[PDB]
Design a protein around this ligand. Structure first.
Ligand SMILES: [Mg+2]
Ligand SMILES: [Mg+2]
Ligand SMILES: [Mg+2]
Ligand SMILES: [Mg+2]
Ligand SMILES: [Mg+2]
Ligand SMILES: [Mg+2]
Ligand SMILES: [Mg+2]
Ligand SMILES: [Mg+2]
Ligand SMILES: [Mg+2]
Ligand SMILES: [Mg+2]
Ligand SMILES: [Mg+2]
Ligand SMILES: [Mg+2]
Ligand SMILES: [Mg+2]
Ligand SMILES: [Mg+2]
Ligand SMILES: [Mg+2]
Ligand SMILES: [Mg+2]
Ligand SMILES: [Mg+2]
Ligand SMILES: [Mg+2]
Ligand SMILES: [Mg+2]
Ligand SMILES: [Mg+2]
Ligand SMILES: [Mg+2]
Ligand SMILES: [Mg+2]
Ligand SMILES: [Mg+2]
Ligand SMILES: [Mg+2]
Ligand SMILES: [Mg+2]
Ligand SMILES: [Mg+2]
Ligand SMILES: [Mg+2]
Ligand SMILES: [Mg+2]
Ligand SMILES: [Mg+2]
Ligand SMILES: [Mg+2]
Ligand SMILES: [Mg+2]
Ligand SMILES: [Mg+2]
Ligand SMILES: [Mg+2]
Ligand SMILES: [Mg+2]
Ligand SMILES: [Mg+2]
Ligand SMILES: [Mg+2]
Ligand SMILES: [Mg+2]
Ligand SMILES: [Mg+2]
Ligand SMILES: [Mg+2]
Ligand SMILES: [Mg+2]
Ligand SMILES: [Mg+2]
Ligand SMILES: [Mg+2]
Ligand SMILES: [Mg+2]
Ligand SMILES: [Mg+2]
Ligand SMILES: [Mg+2]
Ligand SMILES: [Mg+2]
Ligand SMILES: [Mg+2]
Ligand SMILES: [Mg+2]
Ligand SMILES: [Mg+2]
Ligand SMILES: [Mg+2]
Ligand SMILES: [Mg+2]
Ligand SMILES: [Mg+2]
Ligand SMILES: [Mg+2]
Ligand SMILES: [Mg+2]
Ligand SMILES: [Mg+2]
Ligand SMILES: [Mg+2]
Ligand SMILES: [Mg+2]
Ligand SMILES: [Mg+2]
Ligand SMILES: [Mg+2]
Ligand SMILES: [Mg+2]
Ligand SMILES: [Mg+2]
Ligand SMILES: [Mg+2]
Ligand SMILES: [Mg+2]
Ligand SMILES: [Mg+2]
Ligand SMILES: [Mg+2]
Ligand SMILES: [Mg+2]
Ligand SMILES: [Mg+2]
Ligand SMILES: [Mg+2]
Ligand SMILES: [Mg+2]
Ligand SMILES: [Mg+2]
Ligand SMILES: [Mg+2]
Ligand SMILES: [Mg+2]
Ligand SMILES: [Mg+2]
Ligand SMILES: [Mg+2]
Ligand SMILES: [Mg+2]
Ligand SMILES: [Mg+2]
Ligand SMILES: [Mg+2]
Ligand SMILES: [Mg+2]
Ligand SMILES: [Mg+2]
Ligand SMILES: [Mg+2]
Ligand SMILES: [Mg+2]
Ligand SMILES: [Mg+2]
Ligand SMILES: [Mg+2]
Ligand SMILES: [Mg+2]
Ligand SMILES: [Mg+2]
Ligand SMILES: [Mg+2]
Ligand SMILES: [Mg+2]
Ligand SMILES: [Mg+2]
Ligand SMILES: [Mg+2]
Ligand SMILES: [Mg+2]
Ligand SMILES: [Mg+2]
Ligand SMILES: [Mg+2]
Ligand SMILES: [Mg+2]
Ligand SMILES: [Mg+2]
Ligand SMILES: [Mg+2]
Ligand SMILES: [Zn+2]
Lengths: 126, 119, 206, 87, 70, 50
RNA sequence: AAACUUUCAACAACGGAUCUCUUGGUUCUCGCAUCGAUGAAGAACGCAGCGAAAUGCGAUACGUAAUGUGAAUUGCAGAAUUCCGUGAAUCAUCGAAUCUUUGAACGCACAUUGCGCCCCUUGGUAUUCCAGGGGGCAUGCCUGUUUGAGCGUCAUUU
RNA sequence: CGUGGAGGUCAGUGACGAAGCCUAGACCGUAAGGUCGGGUCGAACGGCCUCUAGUGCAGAUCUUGGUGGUAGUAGCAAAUAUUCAAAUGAGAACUUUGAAGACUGAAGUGGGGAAAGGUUCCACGUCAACAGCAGUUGGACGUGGGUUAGUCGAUCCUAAGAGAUGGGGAAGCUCCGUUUCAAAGGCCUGAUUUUAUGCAGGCCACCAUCGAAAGGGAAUCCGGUUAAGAUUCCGGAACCUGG
RNA sequence: AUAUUGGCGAGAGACCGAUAGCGAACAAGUACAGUGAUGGAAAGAUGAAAAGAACUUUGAAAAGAGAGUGAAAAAGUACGUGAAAUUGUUGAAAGGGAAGGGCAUUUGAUCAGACA
């Protein structure tokens, strides 16, 4: 249960704070879990998704498919994978929007900062 | 592109004045160009650039005056702390801690003693 | 207290072929001319607007109060009552079910469940947990989203970790003997909570 | 003639635009705004006109400066600039 | 455009805050040209137009695709 | 009113600009909800009162 | 016997009840003390590559500087130099600025983008006329500075 | 008996279809109502013991919204008046052009303006709504263009009147007074040849300011020119004011 | 120690659930009215995702018919469900200056149960 006097269980307040969260806040909300492999690799559970990352969909219809994240469409709380697309009837193609809680991260994109984030959570890196 | 402040700040007063002119000529040209063209977002970055240059020129002149007024009664009202209008005319710490010759004597001889019940 | 009444609407009087509620004035907007104030009016003030100074709490004589909690404590014996109350106590050794004082010292959730299990609470724990439901109400809109039954109630004489090792498990509540509470001894005013007493607590009773 | 044939003669403003409140309640011959009270130093308003007050109190405009006083208070009216850190 | 071809006139949208002197000096300083006289007017989109007649020594058409428009 | 104050002309001009249909590209924005300009005025349906 | 009228049903209309929803309202409770002549609250007009509004901002105009984050923004277009980085962002924070015309509103006016005075400076052959740039001039009151007024009044000259 | 919400319970029902809605189909109850089937539907809901109330509608010339009969009905009848053909267009009584017949009859249905409007002006495109038939037309809709001044106005002056200021009333918002019981100010040049403007004369005591786009008032005319501006642009010829 | 329908920041409710709740859940003190003081609304919901219907065909066009998307168009930017008044069609029936109702049976249509 909640125990801090500065945390609200209130449903209404939660839904507001989700839907009106600033871009920077959405980055963290949009985390994906690392793959079984990467979790042993880095001793770390999950990470804010980020662009050129490599990813495996593991729920829904596109369950099984994989690719490079080509947008973190924060506005939409959604993520696009360059390789997972709808081809409409007029031959045009169009991205599917996927949720990072429903992906798994199979290859990270590394920075000084990415690495720093991992060390900050007490992980380890190759 | 877009000029960086931390680079503007190393330039001379007159270098900055000239880049200001340079950007202004730039902008003028771009606006001619704009009305012959379906869009022109380049134009944004140069008016932003002028902004920044002026910002920087202004910084340095203020920072100049600020020091040649440091440690003086009386310095221009807009380098004086903003604070709040009330806050500004509240007694200073000095004129407030003020204490009567008689009473200072009192405070000294009979101040709140530290004590405890038990034994 | 101002709702219904933020208008300067007047009656129109009779002789205009039209009911005599007050009516909003001016024009050019369609609010103009409409029933005002009255409780049968769209946008009226309600009939007898509710007021904060309604009686919310209730005094009960301290002695009658204790009569009750005593009665409730008494009934946590009486297996029929405990059975009738929900509470899955056919497979328990005996009632009153008194367990070792060693309980009050358990720090860990997982250990707490283990003890409760061993001493007989297994089905009742499972009855909560099996019973979570979305509340049928609008209650659901209002911080009252889920529902569930009431599990065992663990009384102790001295909390040395037990209240925190049990606090996260569905439907289990803990009480200090010194207190003891009618709301917990007879939920919804039905007698017969399943109570697991620590010895320490059991003898402090007297 | 008191009805419409006399409505035809309505072509002169009693009121124009009021510099202080923009409202078109500046009475020309009286030289005073029927809404905001200009040019009286004080601003017209009345306790029997609450809906009126509501339509004009602070906060129905930009609060160009009062906006920020809260934040400023919270950081204890600090002065200077912020420093720097790493990564 | 036609006034440029035919009337040796440059048309600029100009600051509302600016007068005939200021328009004349700026066109003079910004374009190397000599100005005969400057008519102005306020447009109905709330912006100001300057009809700027250059002296007979300058040819506004030439001068308009120096600044770079056509 | 055929020979006007700047102040009035200025207002008039601000009114000319505000008189246009909704910019259609807005309709396509994520979460956009504006169908049509709901504040369009017309000289022969609603007077400015200056 | 049709048509017509009426009743019932099915499908189709008209209309928006009902059910389910809820970034809103309402009420309670707890913590806190900060508007303004250093120009407030409020007004007006403006500012985006492509905006009418709402939101933001002021000719540095949906923003400049600073700091934290660590790669977006996204309706389209766009830059492309910004991705192991003094660094993305319609991000957060915010300590530095910019802040048009106004408003207690302060050179005088104001149904006027109306009309003076002073200073420094530039240009026109210019202390004097004109034009450009910058900086100034409201009221009551207090302490002080200076210049004064009154046979109100003291001394002092020769 | 029935509704919204609350404590308890049935480890109740449910995406293999909750709730709701429809159904001269079934069943229980004297009745309030309850139950089932079938169809529709799409996410939640119910029995039992209790708690609680913003708890049950046919009426209130009830409130708000919606809908009928009336009814394809009353009507669309003032301002003399229309007609032939062509062109255009999916479409022409109604648009454009030509012809004809008329009208207003300079006290205008002509040519301009003041107040007021505010883009309606003009071009191109163009008919969903609007113009109580129509529409290819428009003061409509869409996209653009357009208003040029030393001399025309404003600006200056004063009118009825308004209204600051020293003041006097008034608890006060404010009321009075306007040259008033006020120490009410600025010009012309001379004095400077440290120098820039201090004092030397003599005046002048007039003591705010707003208030007229018809009153007063310095100065511009003709010809040409635009889709739409012109005593404002172009050509030419003048005149006033300051310096 | 007391007050507090204002301001800033928080945590809540046996509160209201779009004619309710603040007037405003929305570009709401907006649009619109009024010379002015003032007065002052209506208006939330496709779907998980626009996948917002390529293409053919009739049409001047709007659209229709096919096709197509979708778990569903019995969700088509008139959009969840989609009552009633009231309306079109279809089917059945009755009707000599209203219609509807009660007890009862004929006729027609329809249906439950119980039997072994
Ligand atoms: Mg924590
Ligand atoms: Mg983390
Ligand atoms: Mg999503
Ligand atoms: Mg930048
Ligand atoms: Mg100070
Ligand atoms: Mg009341
Ligand atoms: Mg009636
Ligand atoms: Mg109400
Ligand atoms: Mg319900
Ligand atoms: Mg339940
Ligand atoms: Mg009238
Ligand atoms: Mg009058
Ligand atoms: Mg007055
Ligand atoms: Mg004033
Ligand atoms: Mg030529
Ligand atoms: Mg002019
Ligand atoms: Mg009219
Ligand atoms: Mg009107
Ligand atoms: Mg049917
Ligand atoms: Mg509902
Ligand atoms: Mg939902
Ligand atoms: Mg609440
Ligand atoms: Mg609290
Ligand atoms: Mg105010
Ligand atoms: Mg925006
Ligand atoms: Mg952008
Ligand atoms: Mg940095
Ligand atoms: Mg930001
Ligand atoms: Mg500036
Ligand atoms: Mg003034
Ligand atoms: Mg001015
Ligand atoms: Mg100046
Ligand atoms: Mg003094
Ligand atoms: Mg009951
Ligand atoms: Mg109930
Ligand atoms: Mg209720
Ligand atoms: Mg029926
Ligand atoms: Mg049955
Ligand atoms: Mg079914
Ligand atoms: Mg169902
Ligand atoms: Mg659903
Ligand atoms: Mg009960
Ligand atoms: Mg009631
Ligand atoms: Mg009844
Ligand atoms: Mg009824
Ligand atoms: Mg009735
Ligand atoms: Mg009755
Ligand atoms: Mg009724
Ligand atoms: Mg009606
Ligand atoms: Mg007909
Ligand atoms: Mg007829
Ligand atoms: Mg008639
Ligand atoms: Mg005809
Ligand atoms: Mg004739
Ligand atoms: Mg005749
Ligand atoms: Mg005659
Ligand atoms: Mg006519
Ligand atoms: Mg005319
Ligand atoms: Mg008009
Ligand atoms: Mg026309
Ligand atoms: Mg049509
Ligand atoms: Mg019309
Ligand atoms: Mg018609
Ligand atoms: Mg028609
Ligand atoms: Mg148009
Ligand atoms: Mg236009
Ligand atoms: Mg003249
Ligand atoms: Mg003038
Ligand atoms: Mg007076
Ligand atoms: Mg005057
Ligand atoms: Mg005049
Ligand atoms: Mg005159
Ligand atoms: Mg001519
Ligand atoms: Mg022209
Ligand atoms: Mg003309
Ligand atoms: Mg000429
Ligand atoms: Mg000549
Ligand atoms: Mg002369
Ligand atoms: Mg409160
Ligand atoms: Mg609390
Ligand atoms: Mg409401
Ligand atoms: Mg209710
Ligand atoms: Mg309402
Ligand atoms: Mg909402
Ligand atoms: Mg509306
Ligand atoms: Mg929905
Ligand atoms: Mg809806
Ligand atoms: Mg949706
Ligand atoms: Mg079709
Ligand atoms: Mg369905
Ligand atoms: Mg549907
Ligand atoms: Mg469609
Ligand atoms: Mg529907
Ligand atoms: Mg029948
Ligand atoms: Mg019968
Ligand atoms: Zn006003």
């Amino acid at each position: 249960a909640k125990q801090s006097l500065d945390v609200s269980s209130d449903r209404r307040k939660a839904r507001k704070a989700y839907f009106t969260a600033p871009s920077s806040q959405r980055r963290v909300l949009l985390s994906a879990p690392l793959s079984k492999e990467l979790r042993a690799q880095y001793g770390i559970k999950a990470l804010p998704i980020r662009r050129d990352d490599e990813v495996l969909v593991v729920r829904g219809s596109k369950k099984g498919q994989e690719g490079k994240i080509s947008s973190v469409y924060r506005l939409k709380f959604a993520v696009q994978v360059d390789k997972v697309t709808k081809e409409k009837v007029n031959g045009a193609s169009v991205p599917i929007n996927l949720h990072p809680s429903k992906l798994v991260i199979t290859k990270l994109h590394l920075d000084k900062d990415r690495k720093a984030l991992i060390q900050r959570k007490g992980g380890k890196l190759e | 592109a877009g000029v960086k402040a931390y680079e503007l700040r190393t330039k001379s007063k007159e270098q900055l004045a000239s880049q200001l002119v340079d950007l202004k000529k730039e902008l003028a040209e771009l606006k001619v160009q704009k009305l012959s063209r379906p869009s022109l977002p380049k134009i944004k970055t140069v008016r932003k650039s002028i902004a920044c240059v002026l910002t920087v020129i202004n910084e340095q002149q203020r920072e100049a005056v600020r020091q040649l007024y440091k440690g003086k009664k009386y310095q221009p009202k807009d380098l004086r702390a903003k604070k709040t209008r009330a806050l500004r005319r509240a007694l200073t710490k000095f004129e407030a801690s003020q204490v009567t010759e008689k009473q200072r004597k009192k405070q000294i001889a009979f101040p709140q003693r530290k004590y405890a019940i038990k034994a | 207290e101002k709702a219904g009444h933020q208008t300067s609407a007047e009656s129109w009087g009779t002789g205009r072929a039209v009911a005599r509620i007050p009516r909003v004035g001016g024009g050019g907007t369609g609010r103009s001319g409409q029933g005002a104030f009255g409780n049968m009016c769209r946008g009226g003030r309600m009939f007898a607007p509710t007021k904060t100074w309604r009686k919310w709490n209730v005094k009960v004589n301290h002695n009658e109060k204790r009569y009750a909690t005593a009665s409730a404590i008494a009934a946590t014996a009486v297996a029929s009552l405990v059975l009738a109350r929900g509470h899955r106590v056919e497979k328990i050794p005996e009632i009153p079910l008194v367990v070792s004082t060693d309980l009050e010292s358990i720090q860990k959730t997982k250990e707490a469940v283990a003890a409760l299990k061993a001493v007989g609470a297994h089905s009742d724990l499972l009855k909560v947990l099996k019973s979570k439901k979305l509340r049928a109400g609008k209650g659901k809109y209002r911080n009252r989203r889920w529902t569930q039954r009431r599990g065992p109630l663990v009384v102790y004489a001295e909390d040395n970790g037990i209240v925190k090792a049990l606090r996260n498990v569905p439907g289990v509540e803990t009480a200090n003997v010194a207190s003891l509470n009618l709301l917990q001894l007879a939920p919804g005013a039905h007698l017969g909570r399943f109570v697991i007493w620590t010895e320490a607590a059991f003898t402090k009773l007297d | 003639g008191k009805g419409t044939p006399s409505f035809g003669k309505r072509h002169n403003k009693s009121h124009t635009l009021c510099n202080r409140c923009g409202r078109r309640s500046f009475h020309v011959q009286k030289k005073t705004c029927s809404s905001c009270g200009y040019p009286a130093a004080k601003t017209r308003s009345y306790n029997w006109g609450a809906k009126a007050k509501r339509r004009h109190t602070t906060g129905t405009g930009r609060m160009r400066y009062l906006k920020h006083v809260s934040r400023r208070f919270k950081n204890g009216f600090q002065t200077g600039s912020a420093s720097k850190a790493s990564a | 455009m036609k006034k440029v071809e035919d009337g040796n006139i440059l048309v600029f949208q100009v600051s509302m805050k600016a007068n005939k002197y200021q328009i004349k000096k700026a066109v003079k300083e910004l374009y190397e040209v000599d100005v005969l006289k400057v008519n102005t007017l306020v447009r109905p989109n709330g912006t100001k137009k300057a009809y700027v007649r250059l002296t007979a020594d300058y040819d506004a058409l030439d001068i308009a695709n120096r600044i770079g428009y056509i | 009113a055929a020979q006007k104050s700047f102040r009035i002309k200025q207002k008039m001009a601000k009114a000319k600009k505000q008189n246009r249909p909704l910019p259609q590209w807005i309709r396509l924005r994520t979460n956009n909800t504006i169908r049509y300009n709901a504040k369009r005025r017309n000289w022969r349906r609603t007077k400015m009162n200056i």
